Structures are given as C-alpha cells and as structure tokens.
Amino acid sequence: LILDQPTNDLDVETLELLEELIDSYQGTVLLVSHDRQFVDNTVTECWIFEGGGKIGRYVGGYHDARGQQEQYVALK
Amino acid sequence: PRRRVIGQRKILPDPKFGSELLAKFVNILMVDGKKSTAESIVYSALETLAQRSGKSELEAFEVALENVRPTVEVKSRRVGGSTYQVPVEVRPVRRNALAMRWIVEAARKRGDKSMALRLANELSDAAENKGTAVKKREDVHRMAEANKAFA
Amino acid sequence: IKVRENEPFDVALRRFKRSCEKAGVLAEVRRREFYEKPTTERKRAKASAVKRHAKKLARENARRT
Amino acid sequence: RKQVSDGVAHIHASFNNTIVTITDRQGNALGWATAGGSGFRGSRKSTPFAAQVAAERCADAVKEYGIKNLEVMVKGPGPGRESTIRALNAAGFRITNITDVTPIPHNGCRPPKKRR
Amino acid sequence: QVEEASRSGKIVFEMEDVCYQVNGKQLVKDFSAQVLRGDKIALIGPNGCGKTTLLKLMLGQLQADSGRIHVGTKLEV
RNA sequence: AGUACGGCCGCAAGGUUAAAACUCAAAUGAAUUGACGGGGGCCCGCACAAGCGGUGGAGCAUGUGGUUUAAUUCGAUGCA
Ligand SMILES: Nc1ncnc2c1ncn2[C@@H]1O[C@H](COP(=O)(O)OP(=O)(O)OP(=O)(O)O)[C@@H](O)[C@H]1O
Ligand SMILES: [Mg+2]
Ligand SMILES: [Mg+2]
Ligand SMILES: [Mg+2]
Ligand SMILES: [Mg+2]
Ligand SMILES: [Mg+2]
Ligand SMILES: [Mg+2]
Ligand SMILES: [Mg+2]
Ligand SMILES: [Mg+2]
Ligand SMILES: [Mg+2]
C-alpha cells in the first residue's frame, strides 16, 4: 500500500475504520500524512525529512520518532 | 537458588583490548558455541564504528551502549490474587547485561546483509539515540513510570 | 489531634493521631453490628491474653540456650 | 484575583480516592484536584503516590491567588493521608498547624451490614 | 475490508547511494535504506520536500539520477 | 417423628399433649494412629523468577490407536 494523504477529506467516523484496517494489514504499508493522531495507531517507523536531501529514519509512531529527534547527537 | 548464593564466574578478557566488557559482548551473540565466528563479527563491526565516529574502539562501544542501558525495569509481583507489576531499580552490573542483549536481539531483525554489517548499523544507531535498541529502553522506561505508584 | 508545631519543626512526624482517633477507631465503624460478635471477640481477645500469662510463667524451664 | 494570603487545605482521604481542595478561611473554595482526575483511573488511585500528584496539581491552579500560608485539615483514614501533606510542603506552602477532622459518631446511625 | 494476497519477497524496496536532486535544491541526497516485509513506514516532513516524488522513484515513475533501486519480487501494489 | 389423627390454646402463623405400621443391624459419644485441607509455622528443588534452546506447523524414520485383512502373532495403556 502506498498512501499519499489517504485521509484528506474523510470524516473521523470513516477515518476510524481506516486506522483499524491499515493497522491489521499484513503486507507492507508506506503512508504519507500531515496529521498526528492518525500515525500513532498505524505506523511503527518514520522517515523524517530534512533539508539538503537528507532523510532521518527513526523508530516508533509519530511522537516516538519526534522524541528521538530531540535527543539526536548525529555521531560526532 | 533458595539456600545458595553465587559469587561470580571468571571470563577471559578480549584479546585486542584487555577489557572484560567487550569480552562478555562476544559471548552474548555467540551461538552454537562458535566463539571464533562471533569474535570476527564484533571485530568487523567495531572496525567500522571507528571509521564513522572518530572515537576508535571502546569509547565508541561505550557511548553507543550508554544510551541503551536502562535505569529501572518492572516485574510481576502479584500479592494475594492481584496481577499487577512493580517497577524496581536495577543494579549497576545487570545494566550492561540487559543493554548488550537488546542490541543483539534488535540486530537479528532488520536484515540487511552479513551480521557484521547489520550489527554495525545497529551499534551506530545507538551512538545517536536512533535505532530500535533505544526504543526498547524507552518502552520499559515508560512502563516503569506509568506504574510508579507501586514502590 | 491538632498540632501547632511551634516555630521550628520542619517535619511532620504526626504520630500524635495514633493515640486516640485513627483508622483503629474507625475500623469498628466501617461496617458490622450483630451486637454479640463483640462478645465473641472480647471473650476470645482476652482468653488468649491470660493464656499468654501461662506461657509467660512457663519460663521455669532449662531450654538450654 | 483577591490575592488571598492565608488559606486552608482539605484532604478527603478515602479507601478508594483522595480529593484535595484549597479554601480560604471562611470555607470559600478556590480550586481542587483529585487522584482520579490526575490520570490514575482504576486501582492505582488508591495509592499514596497518586495522592502525591493530586496535591501536586492542586498546588497549581491556586497560585493565581498567591496562597503563601496554609493550614491543613485531614479527614478520613486512607492511603494518601500523609503523602498529600508532604506534597504541599514541597509545593512551597508554609504549613502552620495540622488538623484531624475525621467524623466519628457517638454510636449514631447503623453502618452497612458486612461483606462476605 | 482489505484483500490480502500472497506474501511478498522479504525485501520490498532496496535503494543505496541513490541521490536525486531537482534543478535548484536536493530532494534526496545519498539515500541508503531498506523496506522489509510487514514493515509499516510513515513519510513525514515539510511541504514540497519530495515525499510524493520519493514514491515515484520506488515505483519507477521517474528515474533516479544515480544509485539504482531494486524492487520486490512478488509485489501487488 | 417431634410427624399423623384427636384434644386444649391462638386473629393467623402455629404452639403444647402425642402415636403406629413399616424398614435397617446399626445409630451414637470420647479419644488413638494415619491421610487430607482453596488451615498455620520452618525448610527444600529447574517449582516459579532470571536465561539459553526446543516440541506443537512442514517432509521423513519409528512405535501406538482406529480401520481394513486369510493373518496384519502376543505383550506394555496416566506420572511409572
Ligand atoms: N512536475 C514537476 N516539475 C517540476 N518540479 C516539480 C514537479 N513535481 C514536483 N516538483 C518539485 O519537486 C519538489 C517536491 O515535490 P513533491 O510533489 O515530491 O512534494 P512533497 O514532498 O510530496 O510535498 P507536499 O506534502 O507539499 O505535497 C518541490 O520543490 C516541487 O516544486
Ligand atoms: Mg459497601
Ligand atoms: Mg406439631
Ligand atoms: Mg419444632
Ligand atoms: Mg394437633
Ligand atoms: Mg521460567
Ligand atoms: Mg512437525
Ligand atoms: Mg498372554
Ligand atoms: Mg500390537
Ligand atoms: Mg492379554
């Protein structure tokens, strides 16, 4: 599954089902979203974008990944 | 171990660096009693960590470890029909025992290539607070705080 | 019950409630009644006490420690 | 508002919960916090740590009045009987006198039956 | 309800040394990552930072400037 | 069976007085030695806990149960 903002126009009642469907999905899922609550229930990793073509790959939902990004030390 | 108490068991030091810390790490990931192979992997994995970090051999292995060793961890402590768990502080000598374990377990997943490679990736991540091994610590670190009422 | 605590104390140590009013006083009021299990309790609760006087008098023995 | 100087702390310690309420001298409430509302829903709220956080939050939301001097009135036997009043000390309140106001009948109304 | 299919190969996407840059600024500079079976990945970032174009590289919509991308073996996208 | 029928008492609930046929070879009391307790103390041990590695899925080897067969000889059937 590749989802470029799959929940743009959906209401929460229909969005609630999509959170449960995508979660239980057995196969691979790469999803793109700009909201916070939705990615804390479907994803377990992040590819946080940075400037200059650099992508930092963190572990966890949205909030966990942003947590590692405060504590980054970038391997001096 | 009801009546018994056990002092310790002596371990041979690591040959390149006369440190017992790197000597136990080789033991943990060694499987089927193949000490030569697991020793080669650790050497093929910490050679690159010198290349990336700048720190050479053990300050580089320590720094990645130090962000992964925990502070507290929980256990099941049912009283008289209860089923809850109690956060208990851990002694300074069990920290590295748990810290090394979490690295190697998370290294066997995330299969990239030869173990000397996918372990090198995981060690470097822990040098940055980035990989799975750090998350396993925080997953414990949360559960020890969410049950802080028991002490 | 009340503690004025005076000028320097810096710490509670309120073991002054243990005398008189405490959960020891309220435990009997949490529930119950039955009007005679107190007389079963108070008969048991002192039959044992004298039975300890017999064991306390039973120190007239070698016992070799 | 009203910049009240001296207040009173009421702690309703119970076998299941603990409700902290800060009032002025004449029984006018200013704010409150409970163990349950501090993210301790379930069996955890009956533990003195949860009682600590209830007074931790009640120290806030009353700081608008700037309450400096404090009396403590403890009611009811329960876990959070001394944990709350130690929390207020670390919260920065001067405490003058501690009280016990647990209600005890002189053999008044009949209690519930018993639980078997 | 979703329509599950047969399990894909253990490696879905592998791209290393891949570095694609639009005329002005670089969108992806020397990427090196792997996507395994059953791994759920969220792309996040700022606006116009290449999230939509990154997927286009994976499916081969547009060609990487360098580095090569290898795709899974039993995929049903 | 403290029951039935009949008296006396009661507003009623029912109380008091009080059988017989029939059936069994016992019912019972106190104490003893064991066993047992979702009774209590003390102690244990790969019993949990802390760990490493498996079985249960797949293909095969071997034994058993069932079913078939002219016969699928007999035996072993919780821990053991
Ligand atoms: N067809 C195109 N021609 C030229 N530039 C383009 C084209 N498509 C995208 N770009 C540029 O490439 C960059 C990344 O665009 P892209 O569509 O990948 O954005 P995105 O990271 O998915 O962001 P957003 O969340 O805003 O959609 C931007 O600078 C954009 O202007
Ligand atoms: Mg009740
Ligand atoms: Mg009668
Ligand atoms: Mg009778
Ligand atoms: Mg009669
Ligand atoms: Mg065990
Ligand atoms: Mg099998
Ligand atoms: Mg025979
Ligand atoms: Mg046979
Ligand atoms: Mg036979």
Place of tokens 């999230």: E51
Q: SS3 for D96?
A: strand
Q: HEC profile for A19-30?
A: HHHHHHCCCCEE
What is the C-alpha radius of gyration for chain C, rounded to an integer number of angstroms?
20
A24: closest chain E residue by CA: E2
Residue of D62, D57, D70, D50 lying closest to D9 (CA atoms): D70
Bases of strand F lying below 7 A from some protein CB: 43-45, 47-53
How long is the CA D5 to C1' F65 vector, in angstroms?
Answer: 88
The CB of E62 under 6 Å from ligand 1? The reply is: no
C15: closest chain D residue by CA: D82
Quote the DSSP letter at residue D26.
T
At how many degrees (to 10) do helices B59-66 and B35-53 cross?
90
- Whether residues A62 and E52 touch (CB distance < 8 A) is answered with no
Write E20-27 long-range contacts (CB < 8 A, 24+).
E20/A53, E20/E53, E20/E57, E20/E64, E20/E65, E20/E66, E21/A53, E21/E65, E25/A52, E25/A53, E26/A52, E26/A53, E27/A53, E27/E53, E27/E54
For residues D105 and C26, give the distance between their C-alpha atoms in angstroms, rounded to a whole number: 10
At how many degrees (to 10) do helices B59-66 and B115-126 cross?
70
Residue of E7, A63, B54, D89 lying closest to C11 (CA atoms): D89
Q: Which of B52, B128, B138 sits opposite A73 (nearest CB)?
A: B128
Listed resolution, Å: 3.1
Query: Which pair of tokens denotes residue D20?
Result: 């902290």
E strand map for chain D: 6-13, 18-23, 29-34, 69-75, 94-100
If you count residue pairs, one on B and one on E, with CB atoms under 8 Å apart, how many are there? 5
Task: Give DSSP secondary structure letters for C10-53.
Answer: -S----TTTSSSSHHHHGGGSS---SSHHHHHHHHHHHHHHHHH
Query: Which pair of tokens denotes residue D45?
Result: 């709220």
Q: How far from D71 is each of A34, A43, A49, D93, CA to CA, in Å?
A: 51, 51, 55, 9
Residue E25 has, within 13 A of its CA and on its CB side, a CA count of 9
Residue of B27, B23, B26 lying closest to B12 (CA atoms): B23
Q: Which of C12, C23, C31 sits opposite D86 (nearest CB)?
A: C12
- Ranges of H-type helices in D3-104: 48-59, 83-90
Beta carbons of B99 and B68 less than 8 angstroms apart = yes
- Dihedral class, residue D87 (left if φ above 0, else alpha if ψ from -120 to 50, else beta): alpha
Beta carbons of B141 and B134 less than 8 angstroms apart = no
- Distance from E55 to chain B by nearest Cα, in Å? 21
For residues D4 and D93, give the distance between their C-alpha atoms in angstroms, rounded to a whole number: 13
For residues E77 and E60, give the distance between their C-alpha atoms in angstroms, rounded to a whole number: 12
For residues B66 and B14, give the distance between their C-alpha atoms in angstroms, rounded to a whole number: 19
The CB of E52 under 6 Å from ligand 1? The reply is: yes
At how many degrees (to 10) do helices B92-108 and B132-146 cross?
130
Beta carbons of D35 and D54 less than 8 angstroms apart = yes
Residue D115 has, within 13 A of its CA and on its CB side, a CA count of 1
The CB of E72 under 6 Å from ligand 1? The reply is: no
For residues B61 and B48, give the distance between their C-alpha atoms in angstroms, rounded to a whole number: 11
